[PDB]
Amino acid sequence: TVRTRIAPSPTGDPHVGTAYIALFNLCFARQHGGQFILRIEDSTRESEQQIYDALRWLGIEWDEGPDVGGPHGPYRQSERGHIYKKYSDELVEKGHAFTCFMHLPKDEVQRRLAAGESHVTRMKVPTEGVCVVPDMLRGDVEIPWDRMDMQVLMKADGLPTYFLANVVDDHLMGITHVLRGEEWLPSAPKLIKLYEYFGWEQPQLCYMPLLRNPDKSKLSKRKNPTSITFYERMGYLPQALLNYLGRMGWKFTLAEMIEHFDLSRVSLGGPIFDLEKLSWLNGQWIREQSVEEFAREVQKWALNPEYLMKIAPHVQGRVENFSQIAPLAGFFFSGGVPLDASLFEHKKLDPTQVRQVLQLVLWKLESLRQWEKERITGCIQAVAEHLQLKLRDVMPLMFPAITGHASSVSVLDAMEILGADLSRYRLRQALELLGGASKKETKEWEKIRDAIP
Amino acid sequence: TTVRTRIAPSPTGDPHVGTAYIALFNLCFARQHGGQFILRIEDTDQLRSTRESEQQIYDALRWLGIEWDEGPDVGGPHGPYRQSERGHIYKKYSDELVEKGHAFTCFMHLPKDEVQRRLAAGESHVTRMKVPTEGVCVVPDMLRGDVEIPWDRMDMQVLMKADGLPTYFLANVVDDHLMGITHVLRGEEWLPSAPKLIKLYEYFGWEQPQLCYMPLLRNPDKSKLSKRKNPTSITFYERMGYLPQALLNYLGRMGWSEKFTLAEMIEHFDLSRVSLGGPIFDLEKLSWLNGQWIREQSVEEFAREVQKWALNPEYLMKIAPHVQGRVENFSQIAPLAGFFFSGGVPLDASLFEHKKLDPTQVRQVLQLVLWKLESLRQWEKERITGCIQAVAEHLQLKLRDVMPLMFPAITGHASSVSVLDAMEILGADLSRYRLRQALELLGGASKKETKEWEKIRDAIP
């Protein structure tokens, strides 16, 4: 009986690649009457809920996990006790792993351990030869053992590595097939060797080719936004995006996808993520349904009391009649905003300095986990302070980036209401319009970013 | 689109024929329409719920041939399927009902000041549902059509208990909704309270599922099915050596329209072909049907079923040590140990004339022991012994005064292998059955005797 999983780390917005890998694991388990498992290898509970929300929004679901439960849990690493040290001790007891402070003597080792000196547990990995990874799509892949980096099992803080924990947990959860991105293929020999040290039945392996931009380059937020929630906020239908993830992989529904899913129909070249094709498909989904279904989706997306009432106070003070509301508040519904470079000619900031500020602010807001007004303000203020500018120096740059106008409703409020995705998106588009940042400016300015709270 | 049905058994003791019956219908309706069948454990009563009674539910239903698509034992995308794992979902929804004025805090009247004051002082309280007093509710029953229950009939309704747990009533509405249950088939016992269910869905502004209330299983004398007249526990029929296919088939013949498989039962399943009068549970008809299943199969299938039932190393090696010290040759084993394989035992009232207990006292002892053993969840020797001793102690009798009654009840003989060991091996259902029949033979208990002895029972450990 087939069991697949995803093991996302709860460390930020889920992205399209994660949705993609989840979809394949879901269809594969479904196709074979098996189970699909979500395991959290932890990090914040909030980022965890983001993962659940984004994937469910998409239409993906799982049979076992930390939210729905299951008879093979617990499904968060932080709830699975000392189970990892236990198996790591054994690898050490059988001479398949060693304590590192490398050297060897069990005299000095017991002594150093007794004194509570910091240490890790490393896996022994073959130094000579080639390893054959039996990939389901590619067949036999030959990776030489020499290039195989060293591998930590237990870290200095008595926590397992992602590597160790996933082998342990796949075993304990009876996972039969591991479908993962091909980013993981280089380290596959270390996985195989680990199942050998334990004496465990090794699952079937499948390494999916990477998603690529239309310029045959790897997918990156720089070239096209990757977060699932960005597409939600832009007003894409989850069925369209899910449909699109499937057509890249191997117009249809998830159920129809499962019916006609087969791994053998998957390209060995990296599928292209083409926003124009996705928009066209989404347009088709929008058209091919009743006006009533269309209305409900539009209400859920943005024309609902929760979103509108957040906007209403900021608008009530700035209009002399109701027909002046749409021009003032239209930027809350437009995805991007129309851009005008002249809106960014600062009084006492030169064009390079304007780009510098935008880049730094963008970076800090990209790192910002909790999207709240005070936290948003704190970020921009920290950047300004560190540059010996004042808050009032920087704010005029934020208004046209976020709203398309020199002045508007309170832009800090606007950013909280719009949310993280649309805010970063608009900032990035302003920055790009103005000329972006050279490879050299990126290195310089990142030193500065690092010295900023 | 996509039908989803469920059962929500409380994990409190043996699953019974009734649960099996309601399960079969929900399973068949789901299968007929391409949908899913969900098992949900409502451990709303956390103090009388056990992980072992849950396991007994899974074991008994699966033995019978009933399967589910989602549940605590298998997982599922709308879990957790145990109420006790679903967090403060219920408080959340009960809070909305108060905030939206459909439910009130009850500690009487209600001043906004005096209420906050008492809550802040940690005073005990419940949340109650607002139920209409005048007028009637129309219940859209799939089988009987519109049924009109007067609102005057509705007794008040607690949503959240003082211990912060939901009632079974609020929990199942919340969980049917969150699990997207489309059709609800339950016993007609629940029909009187149906208006409150309808009102609650209205309050949340939720789509009400289709409702169907099934007529009660009855004894052959038109009396509602009870442990009294007929044994109701699934595991009893297993231990008596009935085939689960026959019991399942019989549950289906009672329900709609004598030898059919589950797979066949689903194909020919029509909710419309269900009788509106109580289907009769007739042990003799079930037995004839079970005989036909036993007969219409290979001798090798028959043999394997008998092995699984009782002729296996596990069961026979529990018996072996007790038999070994009591025979001078192997052909004396069968007379001595036959009661391990016979179901009931042959009964002889003269076996119960006690040295120092009069006929009424014998019946009281047997009744009290039976009651306590009916309550026993963990069927183990030390615990069986503790029950009988507690009865004996409380009657100011000695254990050795009560034990002579147990031997003939359990084994059919005055003396035998150790009766306490015999009871553990035989198991809870057969022990209870045998004690009940010994009691019936001796004359049972009057209505008055029952009231009086129950008072005695409740004072016993």
Side-chain angles (χ1 to χ4, degrees), chain A residues 20 23-24 240-246 248-250 252:
Chain A
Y20 181 71
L23 177 53
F24 275 55
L241 178 50
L242 188 70
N243 179 188
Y244 188 68
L245 287 185
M248 282 193 319
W250 73 91
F252 58 76

Side-chain angles (χ1 to χ4, degrees), chain A residues 194 209 325 356:
Chain A
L194 195 62
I325 292 168
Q356 175 174 235

Side-chain angles (χ1 to χ4, degrees), chain A residues 174-179 181-192 194-200 202-215 217 219-220 225-246 248-256 258 260-264 266-267 269-276 278-292 294-299 301-320:
Chain A
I175 301 306
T176 65
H177 305 72
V178 188
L179 286 68
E182 69 182 340
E183 2 125 3
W184 292 112
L185 177 55
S187 66
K190 281 190 280 187
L191 178 140
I192 292 171
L194 195 62
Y195 271 94
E196 269 159 357
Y197 292 146
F198 277 120
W200 295 345
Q202 167 177 321
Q204 287 182 217
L205 310 177
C206 190
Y207 291 100
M208 239 63 57
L210 297 195
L211 299 186
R212 291 190 311 170
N213 289 309
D215 63 359
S217 148
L219 213 56
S220 166
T226 51
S227 96
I228 296 168
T229 302
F230 164 85
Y231 292 98
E232 193 285 309
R233 295 297 294 109
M234 287 294 281
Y236 285 79
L237 286 182
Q239 315 100 281
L241 178 50
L242 188 70
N243 179 188
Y244 188 68
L245 287 185
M248 282 193 319
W250 73 91
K251 183 155 198 306
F252 58 76
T253 65
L254 177 55
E256 293 174 326
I258 294 172
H260 309 153
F261 172 90
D262 194 273
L263 217 37
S264 70
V266 165
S267 181
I272 305 305
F273 186 94
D274 187 341
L275 198 22
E276 266 180 274
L278 169 70
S279 287
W280 177 86
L281 180 64
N282 191 67
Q284 286 313 100
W285 274 89
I286 286 161
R287 283 181 275 275
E288 283 164 31
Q289 64 187 348
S290 75
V291 61
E292 296 85 10
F294 172 64
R296 282 190 253 108
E297 300 155 1
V298 178
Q299 291 173 274
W301 165 68
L303 274 197
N304 58 72
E306 193 205 335
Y307 193 61
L308 293 173
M309 287 315 290
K310 288 181 178 165
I311 299 170
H314 305 293
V315 136
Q316 180 182 350
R318 292 166 188 280
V319 298
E320 287 203 336

Side-chain angles (χ1 to χ4, degrees), chain A residues 30 35 56 61-64 67-71, chain B residues 71-81 85:
Chain A
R30 286 288 178 273
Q35 294 84 54
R56 287 206 195 288
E61 75 187 7
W62 42 99
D63 304 305
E64 302 167 22
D67 52 348
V68 303
Chain B
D73 62 330
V74 294
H78 299 100
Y81 295 97
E85 302 182 319

